[PDB]
Amino acid sequence: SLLMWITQV
Amino acid sequence: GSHSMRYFFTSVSRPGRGEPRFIAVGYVDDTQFVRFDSDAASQRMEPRAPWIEQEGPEYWDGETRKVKAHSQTHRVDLGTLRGYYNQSEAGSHTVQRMYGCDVGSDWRFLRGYHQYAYDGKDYIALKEDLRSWTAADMAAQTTKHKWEAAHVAEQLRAYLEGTCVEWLRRYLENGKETLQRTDAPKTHMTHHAVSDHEATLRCWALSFYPAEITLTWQRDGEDQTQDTELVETRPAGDGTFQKWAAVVVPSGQEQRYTCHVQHEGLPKPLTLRWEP
Amino acid sequence: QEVTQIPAALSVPEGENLVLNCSFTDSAIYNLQWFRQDPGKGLTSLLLIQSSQREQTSGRLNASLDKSSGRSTLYIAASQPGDSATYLCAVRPTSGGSYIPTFGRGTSLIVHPYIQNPDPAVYQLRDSKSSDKSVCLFTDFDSQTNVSQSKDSDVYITDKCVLDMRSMDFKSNSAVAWSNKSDFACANAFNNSIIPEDTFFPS
Amino acid sequence: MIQRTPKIQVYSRHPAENGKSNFLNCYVSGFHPSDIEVDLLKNGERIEKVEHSDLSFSKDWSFYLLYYTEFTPTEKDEYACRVNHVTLSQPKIVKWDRDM
Amino acid sequence: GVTQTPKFQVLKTGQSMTLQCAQDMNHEYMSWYRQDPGMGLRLIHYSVGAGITDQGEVPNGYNVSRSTTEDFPLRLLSAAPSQTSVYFCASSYVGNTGELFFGEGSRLTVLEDLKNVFPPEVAVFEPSEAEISHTQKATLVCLATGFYPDHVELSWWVNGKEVHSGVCTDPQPLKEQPALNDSRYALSSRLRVSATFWQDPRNHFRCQVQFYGLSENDEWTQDRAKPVTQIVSAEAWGRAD
């Protein structure tokens, strides 16, 4: 299951 | 034994095109189980392993929304990085991200990862302690600062140590027959005359899983590391792998060499010797 | 999955330190955000606390998060009339894939102005365009009085409003009443309200 | 920036046995950027329905893909893989050798 | 930040319209809400990125699209009275702190018949001599009456410049006919100044009410002047009397 909260570089 | 779940993401800018290309794939050990292609018609996360097809609509809708979010985030990253490196809009660039977790024989958390690369080289990576970052260059220091200020590591660590391992366990169980298996290598040796006083001996390992394997040649008991031609382990296309190692030997001395095969699917390492 | 704010209404005198409560049933949240909204206006973000953190501060505002207990507390120090508004609490899910927030229904807060020198009075103001029509202004009363609607149809009464004259460090409450009825007069305009006994009624 | 030339391996899924259905594979790895052109040939001609795996990469960020198509080997028919990449001044042709 | 338009809009039943929402923060997540008394904020539609949109709690009657990163248009193909509400667009990252950013809000009133639209009448009332002697202060009162829908913005202007000090405007209008669902509205405001300032015949006071009503493309053919978006004002001058 994928990570949900991804942060932009 | 030990296991892992990893997700790989590749985003490529396409100057002149309406959207960049985004491809995501997920793996449990050496078995791929899902994929997403931004250029594809469905626009949904797709199953690529039989055991994952069991998951219901809720799973697929959720994975699809999360992967589309990933796509959007990476679309923005492409522009951001172009800025950090003050590059032109005319060239194509690549961003890659990989994250996942490893568990031991007890299926308990062992390690977590979250690495990022720009144009083929390390950009920023989460350190083993899952609390700090390693920035590859000056540009990455801006990202490091940004991620530290937003407490990214703390929020991420929770996924790596919790959600990631929990779903990995669920997958290992649902896909037992596939994932919790070992296919011992089928081995054999071939002989090919080279010059007139030389011949090539090639040791083969086929139809094995997992991919991890060790092929070594010996001449009268001693390692031939330097003089051994070894090819990268390759996929057969049916879920198993292949590999071979070869040595060139003087005609009439073939019997002096031995090939040694080590794989977890074997109760004991195998030794092969040319037999006329 | 459910966010609740109790009490749903709070009344406090200017200057007091207050506490607003937030409760959520599912502890798996990514963050918790507090907002304030005034009637007819939009939503202003006050504080944002990430689930990995414990508290946030901004001026007189301070909020705590107890994720394990499924609760958050918003503290407002030395409250002012301007803090009057509806405070909303919201959370976002850590997992699920929708990113959709869940909002509480809010707590309506009213911070009553402190009137240093109450001087309740009812005045008649005439139209600048024609001394024909007028309005009745009830003003300078303290926090103790509430303004009621009229008992007659076609009689209009606004609720108490506080105005501030900063350069004079002065503030005052007022409510307005008017009507085209012939029997309406400032003397009886606020008859349906409970007004101070010594309210000034100039003749 | 940095660009790595692809490694190429052309082989069959199962041991070659003339007249027996099999799968011809062309595994390209260790390359970057990901844009790559791979074609399977039969006697110098480009083969019709050739599919490939989903793009993925290794620890060192280099890419890898498996191109494959079902076929029936014979003594006469010769197969090969033709690959073109930015790191290649000319498309590289690797002939299939089952005897190895 | 988040910019949504229009701030005010009147529509006849069956008319179509699109509320715009733009954000320049590279936010992946965008959403639309409607807020109504006793209902709280209800999610209509949302999007986690370009090329994806999903239904919220009350999607029926609304359509959205996310062709770009910056915009998330909300469209009403055929406006219904049940859609009269205040709409809010909200955006955020799908990471970082996850903070939500709300747009300023758009008020929409959908009516079966546009003849129910009325601009406000505005009047300014002068401070009483009794207040002036009793408190040494002078309160002016502005009354905006008989308008519909409740789409107004009231401001005070002293000697040509807007003022905020000493002003209190009712937070919300009152219904002139409380029992009716389509009642006209009234709003009051007060501007208090020193007795000395009011007594100077050189001081000019103006209460301005910006009303948002009909536009050119609306049918009228009545007799009463078309209640278009306009400003209605009332004024008063200081006086020694």
Return the HEC string of E85-117: EEEEEEEECCCCCCCCEECCCEEEEEECCHHHC
CATH number at residue E151: 2.60.40.10
DSSP SS3 for B65: helix
> In sequence order, what are the beta bridge partners of C87?
C36, C107
**Alpha-carbon distances of D86 from B107, B262, D35, E227, rounded to whole Å:** 43, 37, 8, 67
Instruction: Output the six-digit token pair for B225.
Output: 């590391």
Q: Which residue of C has its CA nearest to B157?
A: C52
The answer to whether B28 touches B171, Cβ cutoff 8 Å, is: yes
Cα(B151)–Cα(B148) distance, rounded to whole angstroms?
5
Cα(E108)–Cα(E150) distance, rounded to whole angstroms?
10
Q: Which domains does chain C have, with CATH numbers?
A: 1-113 (2.60.40.10), 114-203 (2.60.40.10)
Solved by what technique? Answer: X-ray
Cis bond upstream, residue C13 (ω within 30): no
Q: Which residue has the tokens 């009231």?
A: E154
Please, what sign has the CA dihedral across residues D68, D73, D77, D80? positive
Q: Do you know the residue count of chain D? A: 100
Q: Which helix (H) or strand (E) holds B6?
A: strand B3-12
The answer to whether B183 touches B241, Cβ cutoff 8 Å, is: no
* E108 shares a domain with E97: yes
Q: Examine chains D and E and say if they touch (3+ CB pairs below 8 A).
A: no
* Domain assignment present for B130: yes
- Chain E CB contacts of B75 below 8 Å: 49-50, 69
Instruction: Tell me which of B162, B181, B200 is where a domain ends.
Output: B181
Instruction: Output the six-digit token pair for E136.
Output: 């040494």
**Burial status of residue D43 (CB atoms within 10 A of its CB: 0-12, 13-18, 19 or more):** exposed
Helices (H), chain B: 57-84, 138-149, 152-158, 164-174, 176-179
**Burial status of residue B175 (CB atoms within 10 A of its CB: 0-12, 13-18, 19 or more):** buried
> In sequence order, what are the beta bridge partners of D56?
D64
* B99 shares a domain with B87: yes
Residue B225: count of CB within 10 angstroms of its CB = 10
Residues 152-191 of chain B with CB under 8 A from chain A are 152, 155-156, 159, 163-164, 167
Q: Is C13 on the interface with A (CB under 8 A)?
A: no
Q: Mutual orientation of helices B57-84 and B138-149 as an angle, nearest 10°? A: 130
Residues of chain A whose beta carbon is less than 8 angstroms from a beta carbon of chain E are: 4-8
* E141 shares a domain with E106: no
Q: Is C176 on the interface with E (CB under 8 A)?
A: yes
The answer to whether B225 touches B196, Cβ cutoff 8 Å, is: no
CA-nearest of B61, B137, C50, B119 to E93 is C50
The answer to whether C118 touches C87, Cβ cutoff 8 Å, is: no
* B170 shares a domain with B71: yes
To 10 degrees, the CA torsion angle through B153, B155, B159, B162? Answer: 110
The answer to whether C177 touches C150, Cβ cutoff 8 Å, is: yes
The answer to whether E212 touches E152, Cβ cutoff 8 Å, is: yes
Nearest beta carbon to residue A3 from set B99, B116, B147: B99
* Domain assignment present for B174: yes
Please give the residue range of the domain that contains residue E16: 1-112
Q: Do you know the residue count of chain B? A: 276
* E128 shares a domain with E232: yes
Cα(E105)–Cα(E5) distance, rounded to whole angstroms?
8
The radius of gyration of chain C's CA atoms, rounded to the nearest angstrom, is 22
- Chain B CB contacts of A1 below 8 Å: 59, 62-63, 163-164, 167
Cα(B237)–Cα(D40) distance, rounded to whole angstroms?
15
- Distance from the first to the final alpha carbon of chain A: 22
Number of domains, chain E? 2
Q: Is E123 on the interface with B (CB under 8 A)?
A: no
Cα(B146)–Cα(B166) distance, rounded to whole angstroms?
29
Instruction: Output the six-digit token pair for B273.
Output: 């010797």
* Domain assignment present for B19: yes
Instruction: Output the six-digit token pair for E177.
Output: 């006919």
The β-bridge relationship of strands C107-112 and C9-13 is: parallel
The answer to whether B136 touches B123, Cβ cutoff 8 Å, is: yes
CA-nearest of C139, C129, C127, C138 to C180 is C127
Number of domains, chain D? 1
* B210 shares a domain with B232: yes
Cis bond upstream, residue D33 (ω within 30): yes
Instruction: Output the six-digit token pair for C99.
Output: 């990113």
Residues 1-9 of chain A with CB under 8 A from chain B are 1-9
Residues 95-114 of chain E with CB under 8 A from chain C are 97-105
Q: Which residues contact C169 (CB under 8 A, 6 or more apart)?
A: none
Instruction: Tell me which of E91, E112, E133 is where a domain ends.
Output: E112
Cα(B239)–Cα(B33) distance, rounded to whole angstroms?
11
Instruction: Output the six-digit token pair for C153.
Output: 């149809």
* Domain assignment present for B275: no
> In sequence order, what are the beta bridge partners of C22?
C72
Shortest alpha-carbon distance between residue A8 and chain C (Å): 16
What is the DSSP code (8-state) at residue B162? I
Q: Is C178 on the interface with E (CB under 8 A)?
A: yes
Instruction: Give the chains touching E; criterion: ≥3 Cβ pairs < 8 Å.
Output: A, B, C
To 10 degrees, the CA torsion angle through C88, C94, C97, C102? Answer: -20
Q: Do E98 and A8 touch (CB under 8 A)?
A: no
The answer to whether B184 touches B265, Cβ cutoff 8 Å, is: yes
Query: DSSP letter string over chain E?
Result: -EEEE-SEEEEETT--EEEEEEESS--SEEEEEEEETTTEEEEEEEEEETTEEEE-S--TT-EE--SSSSB--EEESS--GGG-EEEEEEEE-SSTT---EE---EEEEEES-GGG-B--EEEEEPPPHHHHHHHSEEEEEEEEEEEBSS-EEEEEEETTEEE-TTEEE-SS-EESSTT-TT--EEEEEEEEEEHHHHT-TT-EEEEEEEE--B-TTS---SSSPP-BSEEEEEEEE----
CA-nearest of E118, E130, E97, E75 to E29 is E97
* B229 shares a domain with B258: yes
> In sequence order, what are the beta bridge partners of D84?
D37
The answer to whether B22 touches B72, Cβ cutoff 8 Å, is: no
- Chain E CB contacts of B73 below 8 Å: 28, 49, 94-95
Q: Is B94 on the interface with D (CB under 8 A)?
A: yes
Q: Which helix (H) or strand (E) holds B11?
A: strand B3-12
Please, what sign has the CA dihedral across residues B55, B57, B61, B64? positive
Please give the residue range of the domain that contains residue B266: 182-270
Q: Is A5 on the interface with C (CB under 8 A)?
A: yes
Please give the residue range of the domain that contains residue D68: 1-100
> In sequence order, what are the beta bridge partners of E188?
E143
Cα(B147)–Cα(B127) distance, rounded to whole angstroms?
13
Nearest beta carbon to residue C97 from set B63, B151, B154: B63
Q: Is E25 on the interface with B (CB under 8 A)?
A: no
Cα(E105)–Cα(E3) distance, rounded to whole angstroms?
9
- What's the 3-state SS for B163-178? HHHHHHHHHHHHCHHH
Helix and strand element counts for chain B (H, E): 5, 17
The radius of gyration of chain B's CA atoms, rounded to the nearest angstrom, is 23
Instruction: Output the six-digit token pair for C142.
Output: 């303290």
CA-nearest of E212, E203, E216, E217 to E232 is E212
Q: Do B156 and A1 touch (CB under 8 A)?
A: no
To 10 degrees, the CA torsion angle through B217, B221, B226, B228? Answer: -20
Residues 96-125 of chain C with CB under 8 A from chain A are 96-97, 99
The answer to whether E72 touches E66, Cβ cutoff 8 Å, is: yes
